[PDB]
Write a protein that binds this ligand. Structure first.
Ligand code: NI
Length: 341
């Protein structure tokens, strides 16, 4: 059964609620983004209207085989009427195709559902500038001050400068990048661009990337692994054993691997600056964990919410423990007392 924080009151709508069977009263199911915890339950046998971005709809059609007649893509930044209710989709600064949803309820209440997001000051000049929000359904993934990490731009600068130095020193080094979902594509694209290479990958991953509307993508990626010196592998294979096994398959073209594991936050962010990050090394293999986040830091979250000044906040992440819920409620009250709303 569908929990309360996935229902939009005063509507027939749900958000990210496909794992509960037929939800009573639901006339339109919104999907914020194509990550498995959020699409859990969708398949080719789904027969209710799904509302989403264009990119999410391409993934639903080609990867999950949802039939076309049930996929309803909406443009961004555009007032649309769905089942009698005005909605707008906004870019969430998460993975490709990820949106926030503004719902203008028939009684005058305005609700923002962030989906998953990485808050940014650019959002203060979207269609949110124009009006009041009564209820915020908030991605609280990193809602605690210990969760710190660098800008995506600093992380990419580190990755490009590390990969270019290593391969210039040794032209026979291979670079490998891990992946297990969409998102974080700039990691492997930026490294392959500085190296003058296409990115090589499985047919399954190529198919996924071909759904993302990335400009000039045919110029950037390939399934011909032999032609490429930046390879994508499943995240599970990014370890000394899996990398060794991969290097064997490359027919003596290479004599070294440099690998990247994009993570979210890890406790080494408590101690180590991005500049000072070092790899784990075994023989001719080195593995870097890089803190590339597609969720708000504590400070980015707090800025967003203090600017928006919502009347009520409903967390959508970390909702399962009393300790998490009490921690988040304390920070919401601090923020409100500090800013005066
Ligand atoms: Ni997500």
């Amino acid at each position: 059964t569908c929990p309360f924080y996935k229902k939009i009151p005063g509507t027939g709508f749900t958000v990210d609620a496909f794992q509960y069977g037929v939800v009573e009263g639901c006339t339109a199911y919104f999907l914020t983004h194509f990550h498995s915890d959020h699409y859990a339950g969708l398949s080719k046998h789904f027969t209710f209207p799904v509302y989403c971005s264009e990119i999410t709809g391409n993934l639903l059609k080609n990867k999950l085989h949802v039939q076309e007649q049930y996929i309803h893509p909406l443009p961004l930044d555009t007032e649309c009427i769905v089942n009698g209710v005005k909605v707008v989709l906004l870019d969430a600064n998460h993975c490709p195709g990820a949106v926030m949803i503004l719902f203008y309820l028939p009684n005058g209440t305005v609700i923002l559902h962030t989906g998953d997001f990485r808050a940014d000051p650019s959002m203060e000049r979207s269609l949110l500038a124009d009006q009041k929000v009564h209820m915020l359904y908030l991605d609280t993934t990193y809602c605690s001050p210990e969760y710190t990490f660098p800008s995506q731009q600093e992380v990419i600068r580190f990755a490009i400068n590390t990969a270019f130095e290593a391969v210039t020193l040794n032209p026979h080094a291979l670079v490998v990048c891990g992946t297990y979902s969409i998102g974080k594509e700039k990691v492997f694209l930026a490294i392959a661009d500085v190296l003058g290479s296409k990115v090589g990958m499985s047919q399954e991953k190529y198919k996924t990337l071909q759904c993302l509307n990335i400009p000039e993508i045919n110029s950037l990626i390939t399934t011909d692994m032999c032609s490429s010196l930046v390879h994508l592998l499943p995240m599970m294979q990014i370890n000394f054993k899996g990398l060794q096994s991969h290097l064997k398959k490359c027919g003596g073209k290479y004599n070294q691997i440099l690998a990247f594991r994009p993570t979210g936050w890890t406790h080494s962010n408590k101690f180590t600056r991005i500049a000072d990050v070092i790899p784990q090394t075994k023989g001719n293999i080195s593995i870097y964990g890089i803190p590339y986040s597609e969720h708000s830091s504590y400070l980015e979250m707090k800025r967003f919410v203090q600017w928006l000044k919502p009347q009520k906040i409903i967390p959508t992440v970390n909702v399962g423990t009393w300790k998490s819920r009490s921690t988040m409620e304390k920070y919401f009250r601090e923020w409100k007392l500090e800013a005066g709303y």
